[PDB]
Amino acid sequence: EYLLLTPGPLSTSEAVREAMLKDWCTWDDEYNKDIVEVIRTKLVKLATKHSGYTSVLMQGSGTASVEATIGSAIGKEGKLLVVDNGAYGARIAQIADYLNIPCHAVSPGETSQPHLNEVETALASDPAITHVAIVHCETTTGMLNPIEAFASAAKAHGKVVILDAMSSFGGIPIDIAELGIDFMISSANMCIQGVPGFGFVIAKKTELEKCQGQARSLSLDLYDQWHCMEVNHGKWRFTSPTHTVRAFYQALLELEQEGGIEARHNRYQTNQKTLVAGMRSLGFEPLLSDDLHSPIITSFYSPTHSDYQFKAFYTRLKEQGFVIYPGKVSNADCFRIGNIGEVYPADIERLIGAIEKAMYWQV
């Protein structure tokens, strides 16, 4: 019943959920070859039109895939450069800390875009960096980060590039081979519009090969997981979330049917721009300037009316069939509205009407 205006888990189509009504055996080819290997093939082609890439699927939250990448790719003498401008870049630094990996972090603040000169300066002044981690859509605020110039700078400096594309892959066109991304992480449940249960890594095969024997976790051993899928035709070393994987297979078919990432991006971009215009017509201000907006999720300042309360606003909107999202900026009073999943222009129009009816602090 609710329309979830979240970044994911979000409102999935009826067919994506119905695809979960079948049980699968984890040791049978009908699952491994017919479902898993197909997802792997499709994911690589979605990420790039070029050769040399491969995919690995990993059980757990998308954070477990980010952690599997960091912990498996970085050697004993490695150092990670993190571009931190929100919770996800900060979480990458936190993973490095847990795994005792030295970290250089450029942290301009949660509402600031990192400048190319900041990444270039870190690379030029710290030769110990071996790896660079960047976030494509910083979901914290919904900022769209300029990943091309950062990846380009890192590659020119001979670094391995890790991209957290959790909230962008499948909704924002990117060719990870052209961008020079060595490891791209993304989610089953955001722009692809599947359900949560696993994440995945699309990696340059020669870079993934270097991960062998370097892992800091058995569950999160990226090369071991990949090797098993490679030689055992899709087999996950340990139990996988079968139903969610089959839902993902369905989500990939619906993305092809929509017209691919280009068509999905166009829908998302139209939803986001329509939402921003609608919100401005009601007196809401986006937290970020329009040039920094992603087409995925948008942060808005909380109304400054003395009677405004997020909980009361959230409840009134839920009563009208819409679930909005908490702000994630520690120094700003804000909220978020995603426009992905089963969200179409007609939904944005109904939403704007519902937000006006939920503005209890105004006649």
Ligand X SMILES: Cc1ncc(COP(=O)(O)O)c(CNCCP(=O)(O)O)c1O
Q: Is 12 in the site for a copy of itself (CB under 8 A)?
A: yes
Nearer to ligand X among residue 28 and residue 356 (C-beta): 28
Q: Is 325 in the site for a copy of itself (CB under 8 A)?
A: yes
Nearer to a copy of itself among residue 63 and residue 111 (C-beta): 63
- Supply φ then ψ for residue 36, to 5 degrees: -60, -55
Residue 329's contacts (CB-CB under 8 Å, 6 or more residues apart) are: 110, 111, 140, 141, 287, 299
Looking only at residues 117 through 146 of this chain, which bind a copy of itself when binding is defined by CB under 8 A?
none
Q: Is 59 in the site for a copy of itself (CB under 8 A)?
A: yes
Looking only at residues 220 through 259 of this chain, which bind ligand X when binding is defined by CB under 6 A?
238-239
Stretch that binds a copy of itself, among 17-25, 45-53, 122-130, 226-234 (CB under 8 A): 17-25
170, 171, 180, 196: residue in contact with a copy of itself (rule CB under 8 A): 196
Catalogue the long-range contacts made by 98-106 (C-beta closer than 8 Å, 24 or more residues apart): 99/67, 99/70, 99/71, 99/74, 99/216, 101/70, 101/71, 101/74, 102/78, 102/128, 103/79, 104/79, 104/80, 104/128, 104/129, 105/81, 106/81, 106/82
Nearer to ligand X among residue 310 and residue 360 (C-beta): 310
Looking only at residues 14 through 33 of this chain, which bind ligand X when binding is defined by CB under 6 A?
26
Stretch that binds a copy of itself, among 117-125, 170-178, 238-246, 298-306 (CB under 8 A): 238-246
Whether residue 64 contacts residue 215, with contact meaning beta carbons closer than 8 Å, is answered with: no
Q: Is 164 in the site for ligand X (CB under 6 A)?
A: yes
Cα torsion through 162, 164, 169, 172, rounded to 10 = -90
Q: Is 319 in the site for a copy of itself (CB under 8 A)?
A: no
17, 29, 38, 61: residue in contact with ligand X (rule CB under 6 A): 61
- Supply φ then ψ for residue 312, to 5 degrees: -65, -40
Q: Which does 167 bind (CB under 5 to 8 A by kind): ligand X, a copy of itself, none?
A: ligand X
Q: Is 88 in the site for ligand X (CB under 6 A)?
A: yes
Stretch that binds ligand X, among 56-64, 126-134, 252-260, 275-283 (CB under 6 A): 56-64
Largest Cα separation within the chain, whole Å, is 65
Q: How far is the CB of 88 from ligand X (least distance, A)?
A: 4
Q: Which does 25 bind (CB under 5 to 8 A by kind): ligand X, a copy of itself, none?
A: a copy of itself
Residue 238's contacts (CB-CB under 8 Å, 6 or more residues apart) are: 59, 219
90, 105, 323, 352: residue in contact with a copy of itself (rule CB under 8 A): 323
240, 271, 294, 339: residue in contact with a copy of itself (rule CB under 8 A): 240
Handedness of CA 138, 143, 146, 148 (dihedral sign): positive
48, 63, 244, 299: residue in contact with ligand X (rule CB under 6 A): 63
Q: Is 27 in the site for a copy of itself (CB under 8 A)?
A: yes
Nearer to ligand X among residue 196 and residue 303 (C-beta): 196
Q: Is 167 in the site for ligand X (CB under 6 A)?
A: yes
Residue numbers at the binding site for ligand X (CB under 6 A): 7-8, 26, 61-63, 88, 135, 139, 164, 166-167, 187, 238-239
Interacting residues toward a copy of itself by CB under 8 A: 2, 4, 6, 8-12, 17-18, 20-28, 59-64, 67, 71, 91, 94-95, 98-99, 187, 189, 195-197, 215-221, 236-244, 247, 323, 325-326
